[PDB]
Design a protein around this ligand. Structure first.
Ligand SMILES: CNC(=O)c1cnc(N)c2cc(-c3ccc(N4CCOCC4)cc3)sc12
Length: 286
């Protein structure tokens, strides 16, 4: 395992749900020849959150895929999850800062990699529940990886869905209708979120074009607080949806809209999404 005393703090990487990820140098020979790693810990350790974190850690190390962040180990005294450090950071920050370097062909390359990572999750009956570009990490210009699994759950053997309502704030603008109304999470709800991720990528993370900003504008910024979810539910019920991003090809927007089907069973599979995206990639190449 990783020893506490040999882990040197370098900087804070992010804060989500109930954790924090820090950039650290694991230097066991204290001879600055050690590798930099990412360390995740609960920002406020609760026994309920500790049990969830333990599960999260088991989920991540049971995963080995090119498009999933690598598990490196754990650190015991306050439990800490040690993961590989991806130098380019989250896709959301990377894309926002590098839009001039990233074209549509590369956006589809990332899209394809995200789908393959998700199809791999589904093969283990894992439901991510938090897909968004901020949870995708960039290893290099050509490779992205799903980098966080804090809300990931395992489907029960007898059901094709999982019910769960956690205390606090949820990323409601990335949530499928049945996740908002019934707290139901499934591969199909991950697909709905994947559609939002696709939307995100093609907006190049323009601040005014974010899902929260767009939906709040459609719902009315003169909205309340507890009623926000209620109005979001109604908007989606009446087929209100995120607009086609500026410059987005019509065939890409259709993938988005198909993922945003109110009918859970009509949403495409991740396997099919990969095939349609790779087909469009090839048609844009030659
Ligand atoms: C430039 N290098 C990096 O920044 C970097 C490198 N390697 C990594 N493995 C990670 C992981 C990161 C991270 C940051 C925020 C969250 N959140 C916020 C969203 O909600 C989930 C919790 C999770 C993971 S950053 C990062």
């Amino acid at each position: 395992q990783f020893e506490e005393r040999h882990l040197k703090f370098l900087q804070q990487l992010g804060k989500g749900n109930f954790g924090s990820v820090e950039m650290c140098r694991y230097d066991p020979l204290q001879d600055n020849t050690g590798e930099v790693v990412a360390v995740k810990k609960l920002q406020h350790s609760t026994e309920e959150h500790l049990r969830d974190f333990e599960r999260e850690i088991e989920i991540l190390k049971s995963l080995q895929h090119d498009n999933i962040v690598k598990y490196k180990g754990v650190c015991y005294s306050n439990l800490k999850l040690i993961m590989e450090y991806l130098p380019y950071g989250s896709l959301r920050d990377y894309l926002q800062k590098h839009k001039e370097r990233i074209d549509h062909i590369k956006l589809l390359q990332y899209t394809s990699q995200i789908c393959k990572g998700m199809e791999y999750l589904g093969t283990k009956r894992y439901i991510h529940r938090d897909l968004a570009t901020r949870n995708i990490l960039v290893e290099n210009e050509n490779r992205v990886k799903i980098g966080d699994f804090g809300l990931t759950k395992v489907l029960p053997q007898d059901k094709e869905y999982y019910k769960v309502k956690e205390p606090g704030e949820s990323p409601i603008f990335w949530y499928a209708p049945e996740s908002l109304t019934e707290s139901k999470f499934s591969v199909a709800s991950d697909v709905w979120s994947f559609g939002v991720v696709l939307y995100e990528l093609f907006t190049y993370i323009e601040k005014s074009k974010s899902p929260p900003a767009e939906f709040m504008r459609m719902i009315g910024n003169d909205k309340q607080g507890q009623m926000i979810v209620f109005h979001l539910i109604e908007l989606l019920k009446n087929n209100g949806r995120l607009p086609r991003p500026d410059g987005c090809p019509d065939e890409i927007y259709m993938i988005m809209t198909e993922c945003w089907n109110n009918n859970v069973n009509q949403r495409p599979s991740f396997r099919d999404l990969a095939l349609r995206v790779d087909q469009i990639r090839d048609n844009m190449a030659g």
